[PDB]
Amino acid sequence: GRLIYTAGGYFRQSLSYLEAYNPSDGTWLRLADLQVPRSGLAGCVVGGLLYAVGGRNNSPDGNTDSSALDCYNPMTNQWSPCAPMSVPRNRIGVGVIDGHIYAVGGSHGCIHHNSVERYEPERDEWHLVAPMLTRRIGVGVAVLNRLLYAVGGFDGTNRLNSAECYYPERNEWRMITAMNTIRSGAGVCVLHNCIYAAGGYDGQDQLNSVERYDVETETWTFVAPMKHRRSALGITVHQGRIYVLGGYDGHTFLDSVECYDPDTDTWSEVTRMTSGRSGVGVAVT
Ligand SMILES: O=C(O)[C@@H]1CCCC[C@H]1C(=O)N1CCc2ccccc2[C@H]1CN1C(=O)c2ccccc2C1=O
Numbered sequence: 001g002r003l004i005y006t007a008g009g010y011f012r013q014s015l016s017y018l019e020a021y022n023p024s025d026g027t028w029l030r031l032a033d034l035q036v037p038r039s040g041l042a043g044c045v046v047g048g049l050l051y052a053v054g055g056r057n058n059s060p061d062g063n064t065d066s067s068a069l070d071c072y073n074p075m076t077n078q079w080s081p082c083a084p085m086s087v088p089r090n091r092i093g094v095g096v097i098d099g100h101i102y103a104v105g106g107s108h109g110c111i112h113h114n115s116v117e118r119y120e121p122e123r124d125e126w127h128l129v130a131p132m133l134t135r136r137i138g139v140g141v142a143v144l145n146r147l148l149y150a151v152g153g154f155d156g157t158n159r160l161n162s163a164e165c166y167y168p169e170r171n172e173w174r175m176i177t178a179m180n181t182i183r184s185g186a187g188v189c190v191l192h193n194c195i196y197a198a199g200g201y202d203g204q205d206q207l208n209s210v211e212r213y214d215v216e217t218e219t220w221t222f223v224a225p226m227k228h229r230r231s232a233l234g235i236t237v238h239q240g241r242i243y244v245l246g247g248y249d250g251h252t253f254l255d256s257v258e259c260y261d262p263d264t265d266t267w268s269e270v271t272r273m274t275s276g277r278s279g280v281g282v283a284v285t
Helices: none
Strands: 004-007 018-023 028-032 042-046 049-053 056-059 063-065 069-073 078-082 093-098 100-104 116-121 124-130 142-144 147-154 160-166 174-177 188-190 194-199 210-214 221-223 235-236 241-248 253-261 266-274 283-284
Touching: 004 042, 004 235, 018 078, 028 056, 042 093, 042 100, 049 283, 093 147, 100 142, 100 210, 142 194, 147 188, 147 194, 174 210, 188 235, 188 241, 194 241
Parallel strands: 042 283, 093 142, 142 188
Antiparallel strands: 004 018, 004 283, 018 028, 042 049, 049 069, 056 063, 069 078, 093 100, 100 116, 116 124, 142 147, 147 160, 160 174, 188 194, 194 210, 210 221, 235 241, 241 253, 253 266
């Protein structure tokens, strides 16, 4: 009964929606809105709990970068406040290692963070770990073999095709091989032991392309495109299949949800969101 949770986003202003997709029966649930609307946030899950991390309230009465961490219980349909981050991080990436949420990069104003902090749920505290080699907002994050990979983004001056790896136990970052395309606000996730960098923004155009990093060959490889060039897309994995949700395609805020089958090497559209929206965060539980 694991759902695809889609939290926050942007249409006209930052959104509050929390809604869930059942790929099995194709339904959408409407769930308890966020307390404070936010876009450019990230989602993860730890221990059957869903966390919305960072982002931004872009509203009519002004506009404010999030240091927030809020936690949702599906068992209670309730959001609870959580210890805020040391800094606010809009356009943030997040991953999980040992039930520990890594808050990676993001922006405050146009202060572009290279810094990373680890949240620990039991104790409810953030601590700073070793900073990335590169400031990164619009960054995708992928956990793989208990290594944390930060992929692209936008360093403050140029868009990024570069990726780097964190070694949690050594507390160190190391540059891995750069992507075929430059990607800010791509969808980054992991599937069958490869890192997928889906869509994003390359400077000139919004992207439909997708390439997957083989961690042992050290090689990025294109795979089938999406049908809808997109960025600021939500991404996740659900039963051997990648789900890209929504996004910004240059002109509109997409409601489309496309689905990658790695075996057939194809995407198909499987549902629509209830309303078009960019820059959500999504997490499965
Ligand atoms: O967070 C912000 O600064 C933006 C405020 C205006 C629209 C929403 C925010 C944004 O720029 N987003 C969504 C969050 C996000 C996350 C990762 C990578 C990129 C983004 C961007 C995508 N994006 C635009 O660049 C943009 C430019 C103009 C209109 C709408 C959008 C839009 O959704």
